[model samples]
Each structure stands twice: as C-alpha cells, then as structure tokens.
Target chain A: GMALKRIHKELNDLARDPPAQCSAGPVGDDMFHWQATIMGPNDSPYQGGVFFLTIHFPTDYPFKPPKVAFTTRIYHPNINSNGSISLDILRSQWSPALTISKVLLSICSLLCDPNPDDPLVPEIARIYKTDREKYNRIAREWTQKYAM
Target chain B: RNPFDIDHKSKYLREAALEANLSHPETTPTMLTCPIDSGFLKDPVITPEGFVYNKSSILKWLETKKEDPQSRKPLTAKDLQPFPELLIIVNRFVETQTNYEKLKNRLVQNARVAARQKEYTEIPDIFLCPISKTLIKTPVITAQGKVYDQEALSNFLIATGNKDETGKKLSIDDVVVFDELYQ
Candidate 1:
C-alpha cells in the first residue's frame, strides 16, 4: 500500500515538476495515461518540430516501464513506422528509478540521435547510416507533417 | 555575537513562531475546521488565541499517544486529542516556506553531483581498453567488450570530461584533425 502511495506521489511530483526539456500532461478519462509533446533538440534533423507520443501504464506499474508509443509518425531509424522505440532502457534495461516523464524525455533524445547499428527497422537504418542528407530531409518532412 | 542582556533567543523563537503561525486572512474560509464538541480533531496546533508549541512540545504531544511503529494499527487521524487538520496546515506552510524553496534545490544539486560521481567512478582506466589503448565505448558494452571506433570513442570520452596531456578534452575545436586529413 505504501509503495502504491509513493508511486502515486511521485507521479504527481513529475507532473508538478516538469523537466527543463519538455512537458507531459494527463489526457482522456484516466489520469494514469499521458500524452507528451516534446520539441526536438536544437541542432538535430527533427528540430523546430513538436513530437507527440503516448504513454500507457499497467495497473501494477513501476515494476515495469510504461508502454510508450508515438501516436505521430517519425522517420527515425530506431523508431518503427508507428513510432515504437528501440531504446534498451524502455525494454530490458528499465530500472524502477526511472519515471514516465523520464522515459518520454529519453524517447525524445532517441529521436534526435537514433541508434542505427541496432535498429528495429532495418530499411530505415540502411538509409540513416548511408545517405545522411537524404535521411535528414525525409525526417524533416515527417516532422512537419505529423508533428506540429 | 550577543552583547545585550535581552532575551534575544526568546525573541527569535517568538518571531519564528509568529511567522509560522500567521496565515493569509483570506485562507480561513477555505480552511477545514475542527468539529465542534467532537473528539475527531485536536486543538489547533497553534491556537487562534496565540498559544504556541515549539518542536519539543509538539514531539511530547505525539509521544503521549505513541503507537508502536511496527504495530499494524500504528495510529490514525482519530488517535490524537486534537485532530489532524491543524497539523496538516502547519506542515503545509513549513513545507512551502522552507523545504520547497530551499531544500528542494539543494537536494537537486546533490542528486546531480551523485549522478556525475557514478558516471565518472571508473576514471581513466574505464575509458581505456587494456589492449587497444583507445577509450572504451560504454555500455563497454557487451560480453565481447568491443568498443565504438577509436575517433568516435575519443570524442565521446572527451565530451564526458576526459583530459589529455594539456588537460584539454578534445572537442569541435579539434576539427583541424579532419582538415589535416582532407587538406
């Protein structure tokens, strides 16, 4: 019960205390699920674009990292067509110390610099590593179309 | 620093108590009051009539109702002479004025320092692979302990505060290396 209460308090704390980079807020009927819109880091291909993503938590959460998926499409090598991420921390590397807000920020970082060597989408990795300028143009176009 | 015979200690204590006690007059209406003639609440931790109990006195009040920390029914809002409403208000104010403004920043900086400490714990050795003489890319990173290429590894380590002979970490300032190759 105390663990549940502490998790609840930490979630509220994250909402009240947003990171310097981006903000996450509650949406829909359940306060547990959230939508985050992060600005791409400066000096990155996706810069000047807003990226929208969704975070969904299990009822027995914190023991597991929340299921985070981008609602908007992005052209990053590590993200699949639906914006599913390939970051290790979001999967097997997750620690209880990380919060939902932190996960969202990490996703934003992954978007800025994709991990092409180990990619969920092989074709995207092929383009990202080989034709850098071509990849940047496509990413920018996707950002403009999907992200505000 | 005390030159006077006056009760400076008492004076400051009184000032602190007063500062802790006073509330915005507009705050009263929204305030949850003690139930009239009900045992549910305690007398205001600070009375409207200006009575005050400092830290020790508050502890004594709690000690009187002492429930064992390990016990299942350790105590609840109903256990005290006065109720919890007054305690909550006083706590909220202390948290805002002291902890929120002052301690929070101190803790944040401490936390950042701790993170940096953890990241840098392995030092020069961690950055170097015994065989390659090149900085090891982390996550070091798999069972084979293979690293990112030498130049990229150097760049990453330098970004993380690794220092060389001149005590300088290579940066974009070292773009001349690329120029020398292309020239």
Candidate 2:
C-alpha cells in the first residue's frame, strides 16, 4: 500500500514535470514494470544516442534496489556487450532514498564519464586507460553505427 | 440511484470509516507510534534529528550503519537527546488505550461493511449517456441540457451531417458544449 501511494505520487510528479533528457512510465498497465529512455550526454560520444532502458521494481522496492538493464545497445567501458551496466548504485551502493529520477540522472552522468576501474568490458577499460584517442574513436564509431 | 442516498446509517458509518482511515496522521500522536517499528514506542530515545526511536533499535542500527534512519545524515549515539517527554505521551496513550481500541475496531468493521456493500451498487442514473443509454466514460453536455457520451455523439453528428430534427443548418460548435462534466 505504501509502495502504491509512493508510486502514484512519483507518477503525478513525473507527469507534471519530467526529468531532463529522460522519460519513464509503467509498461502496459503493470506498475512494477517500467520503460525508460535517456538521451546521451551532450559532449560525449553518446551525444546523438537515444538509449532505452527497462526497470523492474521488486515487491519490496525502496528496501531492495530495482533491476535496471539497457534495452538499447551502448558502447562504453561500464556497459557490456549484453547491455549490463556496472554502476555502483545498481550494486552495493543502492539506498532506499534513491528514486527513478535520480537513477536516470546517474545513468546520464555515467554516459558522460565512464568509470574505467570498475568496468563490465575489461578490454574497453584497458583501452580507455591506455589509449584515450583510440577508445574515443571506437566509442564514436559505435555511437554512429548502432545508436544513431 | 445515488449511492449517497442509500441509507442514513450506511452514510454515517461510511463517513466515519473513511475519516478513521484518513485522519490518523493528524489525530494520533507520533510519540506512541515508533516510526521504525510501526508500533507503540518502547524504550524511546530522541535522535539528533529530533525523531524518537526505540533505544535498542537505534543502538542495533548504529552497530552496522552510521546514518540516521529518518534523516540519512551521519549520526552517533552521543547525538541522542534526553527522552523525558516520551513518558508523558506514553502514559496518556495507555490511559486512553481501552476506548481507542474499541473505536478502532468499530471503524474497521464499518469500513469492511461499506466496502462489501459498494461491490453491488448500480451505476447512478446521472452517469448514463442519454443517447447510448450506457454508463458514460467520456461525458459531453449540450447547450440544451442533453448529455451524451463523446464518441457516440461524434458518430451521430457525423452521420446526420450537422442537420437536426427540422433539417435546418446546424453549427456543430453551437450545438455542442465542449465543457466536460462529471456526474
């Protein structure tokens, strides 16, 4: 009941004024299943990319972190080929106070600056650490080919 | 028939039940309800954030966590305030507990009955569209006091081509009032 009340309030707030570069809503009448879209950061290789994400909130959400996955393929050290993101907030760093709006903004921030040390794709991480220009070229190429 | 017109006893019971469900936050004192345990406060101690918590619960939390439960700010046991005010509220709650529980049960029973009765009630007459004779989802009223469901009236108007009973030229805008009304 508390979840329903909080979710309805979140929905009303989102309908009034959505977060910048991101929009999300329940999928096909189920409140627990949601679909979200985030525009890539302006100065990054992902600038022109429009990334789609799926969020699955558990029954004990706010206590448990929601599962976030990228439905759209992306090129970054933190995101794997399977679109699994290696963000700290999605893991042990999750807190009950985090909202969908905050999560989306965090993802947008990750797109702007990839965390090289903790990465899903280790090769990309190595390239990102060792050869910056090659990594940028490959990331830009992937954005143009897949995400445009 | 209007659901409100059902019966005086049902009306009073339903209103009281709704009030009980909605008014607890304003009516009940926060000192008795432990925000962490969601029950009567026991071994209550005031936190630095001006919130009361059971001493054991907050102490147990401090073992593994450093942030205040309510404020999420870094906190230590030294920040706890003296809880002299807690007993005053607790004693008052105990003194009134008997009458409170009786009223609470009566409220619960009335709420259950009201909900069960609501299951079989028919749609109110005013909620029906005049043209379709069905419960209206989207209601539109005419300047003349006729009410029609929006989709049904739109189809009818298009089929009739803006001509009314006398076949005079009818302005679509003049005939229909775009004002949405709920019954």
Candidate 3:
C-alpha cells in the first residue's frame, strides 16, 4: 500500500525536525506501523509520565487519520480508562495539513490532560470537573500503577 | 484626573491596557484590536495624551435615555461575566473615574485575565478544550498528522516557516480543524 511511502516520508520529516514533546521510530514487520513516546505537560495529572502510543496507517491512508491508541493508560477525560483517544482530526477532524509526528504528540498531550468538556467518558468528566485535585491524584495513581 | 480612567497615558493605565491588548490571543498587527466603539459619534473620548477613544461607553450611556438595560440588550462583556477583577477594570474603564491608583488597582485585580487569556487561543477549536473552559493540550500540528502542543508545535511551524500546499505560512485555522463527531 502507498501508506508505507507516506509513513516513511513523514517519519523522516519528523526526524529532521522532531516535535517538542515526543519522539517516533519505526517498528512492526513491514515498518509501516510506528511507535512513540510523549512527555506529559507540566502542571498536569499525567505529568512526569512518558506516554506510549502506536500508529497503524491503513492501506488507504491520508484520507483519514491513522488509527491511534495510548499504549500507556493515564487519567484524562478524552482518553478512556483503556487509553483510547478520540480526536476529531483523526476521525472527522482529518486535514491534509496533518502528519504522523504531529499525531503522536497530540496523543501524548491528551494522555495527561483530560478535556472534560469534550468527553467520551462521562464518569471521568464528573470527577474532573468538580474535584480537580482528587481526580489528578487518581490519575497519578493510574499512571504510576500502569504507564510509569 | 479620574484615577480609574481607561487611557493609554496613565502610568498604570497604558501598561494595563497594553497588557490586555497584547495578551489577547487573537491580537495581531492587523486584526480588530478591540470591539468597535459604538459611542456617540458626536464627541470622541480622547485622552489628554491624544489617544483616540474608540469604545462606546459614552454612547451606551446616552442610549440610557432610551430604554431599560434589559430592554436595550445586555453588554457582551457583562454577559460573559468575566473574572471579578476584569469585571472591575471594565467597570472602571467604562464607569469609574480616571486616575493611576484606580486604574492600577483594577488592572492588578484582573491580572489573572490578562495573563491567562494570553496563553489561550481566541479560536475555540484550537485553544479551548472540547468540554471545559480551560485550554486544550496542544496547539501544534505535524506533517504526518500528529499534534505537538501549545508552544512546541506552533513554534516549530513558525520557526521552520512551514508552508502549505499553496506556499502560505500557517495560521490557527491551518493547524486546528474542527469536526462534528458522529452521534
């Protein structure tokens, strides 16, 4: 699939000028699949954790965002307890302006900070909106228990 | 002079105003700096320093002769009901006297708004979180579709002078693409 070609090119582009918080490299049998490590932003519950994610571009790529998930689970409103992230750019927010490195970085930022406003998990939103410190502590507990 | 006056020359007034103007996320050399003044076209409010008055407090006050505040329509700033200090500064700017202490007091009180709003993008899609009033994680977008955040990715694009397919420099609209999720 031409997906590999796009992935390869984007990988090199990122390497030449990597995004600030994360890094990317190739893995999987065909090298089309990729992995990344994103740093949690300071002042976030997910802070001090290095989030991991995997990207797998479909045979028909560029028309959509690569399917992505947090390999490392952390407390965030946007991410499910299992670490699935829902960003519009990946789903309906897809734009020709996006790239792989950018996606990984986005995933990383999403891990530590939960957007309670645009939430996939209502329960998390309740805690995040009302009891911020308590929610962050729980998030830290989750990160230490799993991602760290 | 009214210590609470909103003007560019009051030792605290100009700087406080400068803070508000500079911190505005959508601020640029070209964009509308503030809401267009709808005050009386009869006499503009000019500071002694000759800073032209473009706001509409005077005009709105004049319209006070017309109808009730509720009937006339709510003020946009008041409707949003910004942070208390901001509310005060706005009141001083529009309602109170002009002097340095009052001006500085108002600015300091609402300092949080000046500082925090600067970090946020005026564009709802990129700067604001999907569900909350606080900001979102990142402001940057990459070539492969990953997004780096706030300072990092946006800086990269700016520093690299990245261009689009049309060879144009990036913009907030360029990096942030809003979408309506499938229910």
Candidates, ranked, TM-score? 2, 1, 3
Ten contiguous residues minimizing lDDT sum, candidate 2 chain A:
A1-10
**Model 2: per-residue lDDT, tens digit, A1-148?**
3355445556655764699989998886788889998987898988888888998877655545678988888878999878788887776666554677888999999989999988789999999999989988888888787774
List per-prediction Cα lDDT, in the order shown: 0.53, 0.66, 0.51
Q: Which stretches of candidate 2 lie over 4 Å from their true place?
A: B1-66, B69-183
TM-score of model 3 (CA atoms): 0.43
DockQ of 1: 0.01
The CAPRI-style docking tier of model 2 reads incorrect
Candidate order, lDDT descending: 2, 1, 3
Writing each residue's lDDT as its tens digit, candidate 3 over B113-140 gives 4445545445434344332334545333
DockQ of each: 0.01, 0.17, 0.01
lDDT per residue (tens digit) for residues A16-126 in model 3:
468888887777676768787787778876677778887777765654468887888766778886767878667855543357776766666665555678998888889
